[PDB]
Amino acid sequence: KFVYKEEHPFEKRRSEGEKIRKKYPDRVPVIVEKAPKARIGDLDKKKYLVPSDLTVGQFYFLIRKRIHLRAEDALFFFVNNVIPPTSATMGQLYQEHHEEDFFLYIAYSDESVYG
């Protein structure tokens, strides 16, 4: 699924995730990747340290800005093949869906179905 989980071992990732969770307790570490069937531009950076109070909608906006996305262009986030509620906080999403390496993984696509 995510290339970050393949390009980096589980043990390395888990150690870094704990380190970040203990040093930046008010923040959530998020790995962000483009879904395969997605026909939008890619994000140079994939790792984001985001305030646990940041919302899905705020994150939509920042990512739109960061890949030079027009408003006519669509963008969807997927957390485990499911579009997160835009009212949700990144912290709540982490509490519920952080993997065992202590990162939150999010895909993005131009389509409403992951692929």
Binding site: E16, K47, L49, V50
Partner: peptide, 16 residues
């Protein structure tokens, strides 16, 4: 553009 813990060989963490 602020990047956190860039020393780690991961490009760092985009600070928001």
């Amino acid at each position: 553009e602020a990047i956190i813990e860039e020393d780690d060989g991961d490009g760092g963490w985009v600070d928001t």
